[PDB]
Amino acid sequence: DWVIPPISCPENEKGEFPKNLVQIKSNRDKETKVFYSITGQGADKPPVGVFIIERETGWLKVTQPLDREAIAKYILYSHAVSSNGEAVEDPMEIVITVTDQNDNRPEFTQEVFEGSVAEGAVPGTSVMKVSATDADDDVNTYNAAIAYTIVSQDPELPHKNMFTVNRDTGVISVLTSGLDRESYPTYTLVVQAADLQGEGLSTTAKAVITVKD
């Protein structure tokens, strides 16, 4: 059977609703007056009424802004019924794909990460790892591509850049020498996670490093 390929519809649509997606048609339009309807999740099943269809023209419409992180794909079924009340077609499967917008900030797995390092650890020694997730599309876009940075260091002694972070993995390492437990035993690093490879939306968390003997 001839069918419509999956329809792509962007999430967070702005403006006037409803918006047209595609028009369906039964070739038995000539034989009899045909009326169109839709069933399935997104139509008559939860969430109800997100998609509607014009009964006479066959225009499939969307009634509200979509959220890809709530529902990313819809499977509907179109129906064709004559004025006499007989179904003139077998129900057609209609797929609606929701396409991504960068509307989710990266989120750290927890607010405070804790770590420790030996005082005499050589520069380049891995200490700890911070991690973040992103709810956006990590398959099609860079909307979930997280880059890690260090925003600030407290205290800024003996130098303000005692540690560094790997922007891909989130691993925090000793950058320079001069760590000293009996001078400055604790460091609070404010770490940032930004999507779009570092260019987009961002969030911050804390990395608390304790200096050991």
Backbone φ/ψ region at 142: left (φ over 0), alpha (ψ -120 to 50), beta: alpha
- Looking at 69, 89, 107, 138, which residue binds its own copies (CB under 8 A)? 89
Identity of the residue, 72 or 88, whose beta carbon is nearer to Ca ion in the bound complex:
72
Answer yes or no whether residue 212 interacts with its own copies by CB under 8 A. no
* Helix H or strand E segment including 142: none
Position 24 contacts its own copies (CB under 8 A): yes
Here the tokens at position 159 are 């130098």
Kindly state whether residue 96 participates in binding its own copies, applying the rule CB under 8 A. Answer: no
Question: Which runs of E-coded beta strand occur in 44-159?
Answer: 51-53, 59-62, 73-82, 92-99, 107-108, 112-118, 126-129, 132-133, 147-154
Residue 3 contacts its own copies per CB under 8 A: yes
Phi, psi of 28 (to 5 degrees): -85, 20
| Residue 122 in the binding site for its own copies (CB under 8 A) | no
Confirm or reject binding of residue 25 to its own copies (CB under 8 A).
Answer: yes
Size, binding site for its own copies by CB under 8 A = 17
* 3-state secondary structure at position 197: helix
**Total residue length of the chain:** 213
Question: Which of the ranges 26-34, 144-152, 163-171, 190-198 carries the binding residues for its own copies, by CB under 8 A?
Answer: 26-34
Options 21, 92, 171, 201; binder of its own copies; rule CB under 8 A: 92
| Cβ–Cβ < 8 Å for 93, 77 | yes
| Tokens read off for 212 | 């050991």
Q: Is 9 in the site for its own copies (CB under 8 A)?
A: no
The item of Ca ion, its own copies, none sharing an interface with residue 104, based on CB under 5 to 8 Å by kind, is: Ca ion
Q: Which residues bind its own copies (CB under 8 A)?
A: 1-5, 23-28, 58, 78, 80, 89, 92-93
Annotated binding site for Ca(2+): 103, 134
